[PDB]
Write a protein that holds these residues in place. Structure first.
Motif, short mmCIF file in Angstrom:
data_model
loop_
_atom_site.label_atom_id
_atom_site.label_comp_id
_atom_site.label_asym_id
_atom_site.label_seq_id
_atom_site.Cartn_x
_atom_site.Cartn_y
_atom_site.Cartn_z
N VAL A 167 -40.92 -46.24 -0.51
CA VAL A 167 -42.14 -46.57 -1.26
C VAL A 167 -42.17 -48.05 -1.60
O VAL A 167 -43.22 -48.69 -1.56
CB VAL A 167 -42.23 -45.69 -2.52
N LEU A 168 -41.01 -48.62 -1.93
CA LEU A 168 -40.98 -50.02 -2.35
C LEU A 168 -41.23 -50.97 -1.19
O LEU A 168 -41.82 -52.04 -1.39
CB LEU A 168 -39.64 -50.32 -3.02
N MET A 169 -40.80 -50.61 0.02
CA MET A 169 -41.04 -51.49 1.16
C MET A 169 -42.48 -51.40 1.66
O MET A 169 -43.07 -52.41 2.05
CB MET A 169 -40.06 -51.16 2.29
N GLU A 170 -43.05 -50.19 1.65
CA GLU A 170 -44.43 -50.04 2.10
C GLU A 170 -45.41 -50.69 1.13
O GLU A 170 -46.37 -51.34 1.55
CB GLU A 170 -44.76 -48.56 2.29
N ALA A 171 -45.18 -50.52 -0.17
CA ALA A 171 -46.06 -51.13 -1.16
C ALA A 171 -45.84 -52.63 -1.26
O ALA A 171 -46.77 -53.37 -1.61
CB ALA A 171 -45.85 -50.48 -2.53
N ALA A 172 -44.64 -53.10 -0.97
CA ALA A 172 -44.32 -54.53 -1.05
C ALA A 172 -43.26 -54.84 0.00
O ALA A 172 -42.06 -54.61 -0.22
CB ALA A 172 -43.83 -54.91 -2.45
N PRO A 173 -43.66 -55.37 1.15
CA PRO A 173 -42.69 -55.64 2.22
C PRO A 173 -41.85 -56.89 2.00
O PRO A 173 -40.84 -57.06 2.70
CB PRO A 173 -43.58 -55.79 3.46
N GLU A 174 -42.22 -57.76 1.06
CA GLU A 174 -41.50 -59.01 0.86
C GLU A 174 -40.16 -58.83 0.15
O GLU A 174 -39.35 -59.76 0.15
CB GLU A 174 -42.36 -60.00 0.07
N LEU A 175 -39.90 -57.65 -0.43
CA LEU A 175 -38.69 -57.46 -1.22
C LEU A 175 -37.43 -57.41 -0.36
O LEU A 175 -36.32 -57.59 -0.90
CB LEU A 175 -38.79 -56.18 -2.05
N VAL A 176 -37.56 -57.17 0.94
CA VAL A 176 -36.38 -57.07 1.81
C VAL A 176 -35.66 -58.41 1.89
O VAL A 176 -34.43 -58.47 1.87
CB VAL A 176 -36.79 -56.55 3.20
N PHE A 177 -36.42 -59.50 1.99
CA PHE A 177 -35.84 -60.83 2.12
C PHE A 177 -35.18 -61.30 0.83
O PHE A 177 -34.27 -62.14 0.88
CB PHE A 177 -36.91 -61.84 2.54
N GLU A 178 -35.61 -60.79 -0.32
CA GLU A 178 -35.15 -61.29 -1.61
C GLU A 178 -33.66 -61.01 -1.83
O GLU A 178 -33.25 -59.84 -1.78
CB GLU A 178 -35.97 -60.66 -2.73
N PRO A 179 -32.84 -62.03 -2.06
CA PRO A 179 -31.45 -61.79 -2.45
C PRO A 179 -31.30 -61.72 -3.96
O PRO A 179 -32.15 -62.17 -4.73
CB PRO A 179 -30.73 -63.03 -1.89
N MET A 180 -30.18 -61.13 -4.39
CA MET A 180 -29.88 -61.06 -5.81
C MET A 180 -29.60 -62.45 -6.36
O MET A 180 -28.75 -63.18 -5.84
CB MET A 180 -28.68 -60.14 -6.06
N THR A 181 -30.31 -62.82 -7.42
CA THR A 181 -30.27 -64.17 -7.95
C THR A 181 -29.20 -64.39 -9.01
O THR A 181 -28.94 -65.54 -9.37
CB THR A 181 -31.64 -64.55 -8.52
N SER A 182 -28.59 -63.32 -9.53
CA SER A 182 -27.57 -63.49 -10.55
C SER A 182 -26.36 -64.23 -9.99
O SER A 182 -26.15 -64.32 -8.78
CB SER A 182 -27.11 -62.14 -11.10
N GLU A 183 -25.54 -64.76 -10.90
CA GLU A 183 -24.34 -65.48 -10.49
C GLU A 183 -23.33 -64.54 -9.85
O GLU A 183 -22.70 -64.88 -8.84
CB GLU A 183 -23.73 -66.21 -11.68
#
Ligand SMILES: C[C@@H]1NC(=O)N[C@@H]1CCCCCC(=O)O
Ligand SMILES: [Ca+2]
Length: 587
Positions: free
Chosen positions: A71-87
């Motif tokens: 559901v998260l990829m179909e509703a928003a495909p840009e999240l796959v590229f996003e890496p975790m930003t925490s240290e």
């Protein structure tokens, strides 16, 4: 607030942010009916970040909720590229998480969306540290090989995964595989990765070195991975012929030997603090190598050098026992009546009725002391295995030189640095006992100790009056008196009406400790031989000491002596390398 407390706070904090935000919770809870109700009508921003900077998809990948993640990829495909930003988790993507849990369907969907396989997870938890329970590298392909999912490994390769990828420590995928618990699984996974190599004789991946200058094969021996070491040996051994049970196999013997300053696999095994690496020396390519180097050219030179150093030491003591002697010129013996002193320091030593015979011996004790420093001081950096022989030999030459510096200045306490040279010089002879292993070692060990301490004790009491405490009035008496003090038969030389030299109390305390240890060690040695197979644990320690000594002799000895091990291949015609011919029988 330790670093481990912070991540405990953060991991507890992360569950709070997941609990607070209804989107993160539904991804964790796999509530699909929510996600549509959450997002399509008054949807909280899909690019929401949690406590660890995780996406709603990142949470959906951790807990294997494929349906919620879809559901998260179909509703928003840009999240796959996003890496975790925490240290802590900087660089990790949703593809890294899906590979770990071996969620193949989610991995398959993520590459369909073009998830970068070059993504490096440079976070702090991914560092190769003892406080991290697992070390898998930084690339998603490296994660697949470590979890043992051959399906993900080739699947990642298909989408252009680079097998030559090196992490922050310069480790390739192969380097990481050797640093794994399940060695027998990694052996299968290791061969899978090698087939995808370009097949070029150049640029072979097994040749790509660690940033510490370590190939995968060399790292396996250093780390002590026997399963990988035996595995990686199949590539570099060649079977000449099969004659019934006998099998003559030829070993490469290339990265296992020496024309490298620190590239020697032997030097790396004997200098590492990894006790597990001691067993790599017992492997069938190595155990023959070290045994041949010791049988000839390792054993004689050690004994040849052994007799020289022994002769060097007795010569030095010969100068000490008959050193300059002068009467008590001062009438000071009457005041401070405790003194039994007849001090004997003079500067009329040039006169030579028999003194030059000592002068040439004293010259030998100096030119040998600087030669000792000419071979150990330029050999800076330090691990002792065969013994602390190198630590004691330099301090001995330090004492002789100091004793020489004490000379010509005519300082009264010339005995102090000269006594330290006797014990330090003689006790190093007992290190030569490596070349009847039970008892007889102590027998020769104990003989060296008295000659090192009886000769010392004779020097201290050479000045004092032998009427009171005349335990060592003679050198043959110093030998016998210290010989029986070794077994506590004679009470320790003590007289309290007079004041004894402080070197006696120092030397006796050091003598009393050693005498008990060797007697303590001898008794257990008698039990330990018939105790259990611990004798092998006691045996392989000495065998490692012999190998450590053998590598020590090959460094400084020139090329004319001690020719190279194995046989060269350049005509006969198989190598710039040197091969060792080994044949074994099977039953
Ligand atoms: C569970 C945590 N939540 C999350 O989203 N990523 C973390 C993954 C934990 C792996 C820690 C690996 C290590 O010990 O280095
Ligand atoms: Ca007594």
């Amino acid at each position: 607030e330790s670093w481990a407390q912070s991540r405990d706070e953060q991991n507890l904090l992360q569950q709070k942010r997941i609990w607070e935000s209804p989107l993160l919770l539904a991804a964790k809870e796999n509530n699909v009916q929510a996600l549509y109700k959450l997002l399509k009508f008054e949807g909280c921003e899909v690019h929401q970040k949690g406590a660890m900077g995780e996406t709603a998809l990142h949470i959906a990948a951790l807990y294997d909720n494929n349906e919620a993640a879809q559901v998260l990829m179909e509703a928003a495909p840009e999240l796959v590229f996003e890496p975790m930003t925490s240290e802590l988790y900087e660089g990790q993507t949703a593809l890294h998480i899906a590979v770990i849990n071996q969620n193949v369907n989610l991995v398959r969907a993520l590459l369909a969306r073009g998830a970068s396989v070059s993504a490096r997870a440079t976070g702090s938890v991914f560092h190769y540290r003892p406080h991290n329970l697992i070390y898998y590298g930084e690339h998603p392909l490296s994660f697949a090989a470590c979890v043992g999912s051959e399906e993900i490994v080739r699947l990642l390769i298909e989408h252009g995964a680079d097998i030559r990828a090196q992490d922050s420590l310069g480790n390739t995928v192969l380097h990481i595989l050797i640093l794994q618990p399940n060695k027998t699984f990694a052996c299968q996974m290791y061969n899978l990765l090698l087939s995808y190599d370009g097949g070029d004789h150049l640029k072979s991946l097994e040749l790509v070195p660690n940033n510490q200058g370590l190939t995968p094969f060399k790292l396996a021996g250093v780390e002590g991975n026997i399963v990988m070491f035996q595995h990686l040996m199949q590539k570099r051994k060649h079977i000449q012929w099969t004659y019934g049970p006998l099998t003559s196999t030829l070993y490469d013997l290339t990265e296992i030997d020496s024309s490298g300053d620190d590239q020697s696999l032997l030097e790396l095994i004997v200098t590492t603090k990894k006790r597990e690496a001691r067993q790599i020396l017992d492997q069938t390519p190595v155990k023959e190598l070290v045994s041949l180097k010791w049988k000839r050219y390792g054993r004689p030179y050690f004994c040849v050098l052994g007799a020289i150093y022994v002769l060097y030491i007795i010569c030095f003591t010969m100068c000490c026992v008959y050193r300059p002697l002068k009467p008590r010129i001062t009438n000071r013996t009457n005041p401070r009546d405790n003194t039994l002193l007849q001090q004997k320091l003079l500067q009329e030593a040039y006169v030579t009725p028999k003194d030059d015979l000592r002068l040439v011996g004293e010259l030998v004790s100096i030119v040998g002391a600087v030669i000792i420093l000419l071979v150990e001081i330029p050999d800076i950096f330090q691990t002792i295995l065969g013994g602390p022989f190198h630590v004691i030999i330099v301090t001995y030459a330090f004492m002789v030189l100091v004793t020489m510096v004490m000379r010509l200045t005519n300082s009264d306490g010339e005995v102090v640095p000269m006594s330290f040279a006797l014990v330090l010089g003689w006790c190093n002879v007992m290190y030569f006992a490596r070349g009847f292993g039970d008892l007889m070692r102590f027998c020769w060990l104990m003989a060296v100790v008295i000659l090192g301490f009886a000769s010392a004790f004779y020097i201290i009491f050479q000045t004092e009056d032998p009427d009171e405490l005349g335990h060592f009035y003679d050198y043959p008496m110093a030998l016998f008196s210290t010989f029986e003090l070794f077994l506590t038969i004679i009470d320790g030389p003590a007289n309290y009406d007079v004041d004894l030299p402080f070197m006696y109390s120092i030397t006796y305390a050091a003598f009393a400790i050693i005498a008990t240890l060797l007697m303590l060690n001898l008794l257990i040695a008698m039990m330990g031989d018939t105790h259990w197979r611990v004798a092998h644990e006691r045996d392989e320690l000495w065998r490692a000491q012999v190998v450590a000594t053998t590598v020590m002799l090959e460094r400084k000895l020139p090329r004319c002596l001690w020719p190279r091990s194995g046989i060269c291949g350049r005509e006969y015609g198989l190598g710039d390398r040197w091969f060792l011919r080994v044949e074994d029988r099977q039953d």
